[PDB]
């Protein structure tokens, strides 16, 4: 327990022990490397920001400064991470200078393929990032899901990080492994500004993996403020106006259990649906009623739509509807509100309807394969 001693001393920094440990000790090459639970001593040091231990550490000896280990932030550890990384993610600006002013690789990763650059960006470290930036570091390497440095940015709503990237250059057109972009990003998180920001540079509107263009992104997401601006924008066509109304009403009912609000968006949609006497887009017809969705149908006019609000068990068979007509079976929120929907007439004695929603969405799930009930008694958000 002398390799335990001198990591204690480095992780915490108390640098004065390991300078008197080490001195009564070439083998302390030996020591120094010593990998203790993951982390070597250079890791714990530049993850906790002891600027004199790294400097020291490095100075000192033939220190390894690329060797990762495992570090932690907020609880989700991360593994293979090289002391550069652990330092920017950790906002250490002095140690991430010192690390690279003494020969740090900057575009080395962690085992999920994450950069400095990365976790500085997931932060909303902005003069960490312009200093990887400016000691060439590599805009485009994406983690192993093909998420960017400006994917992430955007999703944590870090505006001026994003800005900076894109004057440097940053592509605004890639696409993930799953077809996320950039403007999937913003339409999650609510981020009109950086979206319209990315707009400036042409990023194009498209279909993610699941069908899902950035307006329907929001629409799921229930961020009104994205679905009002991409609904007067004229990349979206009439038909994806109305389907994405009809989806926000939807996440109204299930999500901000918001009656109101899903009510006034049905109308809008209803009303566009209708607007052209010449040229009514009617409702898809389904294959067949389902009896987990009380055999209702969508309705199919305005008149239909005035009653609604005093039936609000018809309202959220109008929302399984319309979820499953616009995201179809194979999106997650599809069988997950199914799901919760058969929870609150548990809730309430209906278990019977309770039991069909949730055979529904079983069936659903187990009829396209290639949030269980237990895991509940997403994945953007990792610095890896």
Not at 53 to 62: G, H, K, N, T
Not at 267 to 289: E, F, H, W
Not at 337 to 362: E, Q
Request: charged fraction near 25%.
């Amino acid at each position: 327990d002398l390799k335990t001693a001198v990591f204690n001393a480095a992780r915490d920094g108390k640098l004065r022990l390991l300078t008197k440990l080490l001195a009564s000790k070439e083998e302390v090459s030996s020591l120094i490397s010593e990998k203790t639970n993951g982390a070597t001593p250079l890791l714990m040091a530049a993850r906790y920001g002891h600027l004199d231990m790294v400097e020291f550490l490095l100075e000192q000896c033939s220190a390894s400064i690329e060797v990762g280990g495992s570090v932690n932030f907020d609880g989700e550890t991360i593994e293979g991470a090289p002391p550069l990384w652990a330092a920017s993610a950790a906002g250490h600006l002095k140690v991430v200078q010192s690390l690279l002013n003494h020969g740090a690789s900057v575009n080395n990763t962690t085992l999920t393929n994450s950069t400095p650059l990365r976790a500085a960006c997931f932060d909303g470290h902005l003069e960490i990032v312009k200093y990887l930036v400016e000691h060439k570091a590599d805009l485009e390497v994406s983690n192993r899901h093909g998420h960017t440095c400006l994917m992430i940015s955007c999703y944590k709503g870090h505006k001026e990080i994003a800005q900076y990237l894109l004057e440097k250059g940053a592509d605004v057109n890639r696409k993930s492994v799953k077809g996320n972009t950039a403007l999937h990003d913003c339409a999650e998180s609510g981020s009109l500004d950086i979206m319209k920001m990315l707009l400036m540079y042409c990023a194009k509107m498209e279909k993610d993996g699941y069908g899902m263009t950035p307006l329907l992104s929001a629409s799921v997401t229930g961020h009104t403020n994205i679905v009002d601006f991409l609904t007067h924008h004229a990349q979206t066509s009439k038909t994806e106006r109305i389907n994405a109304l009809e989806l926000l009403g939807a996440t109204f009912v299930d999500k901000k259990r918001d009656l109101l609000g899903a009510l006034k968006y049905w109308k809008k949609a209803m009303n566009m649906r209708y607007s052209d006497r010449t040229n009514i887009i009617s409702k898809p017809v389904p294959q067949t009623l389902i009896m987990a969705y009380d055999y209702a149908k969508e309705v199919n006019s305005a008149e239909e739509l005035e009653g609604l609000i005093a039936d609000p068990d018809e309202m959220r068979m109008q929302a399984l509807l319309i979820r499953e007509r616009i995201l179809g079976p194979s999106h997650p929120d599809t069988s997950y509100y199914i799901r919760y929907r058969g929870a609150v007439y548990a809730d309430s004695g209906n278990f019977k309807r309770c039991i069909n929603l949730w055979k529904y969405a079983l069936d659903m799930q187990q009829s396209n394969l290639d949030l269980s009930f237990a895991e509940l008694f997403l994945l953007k958000e990792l610095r890896g």
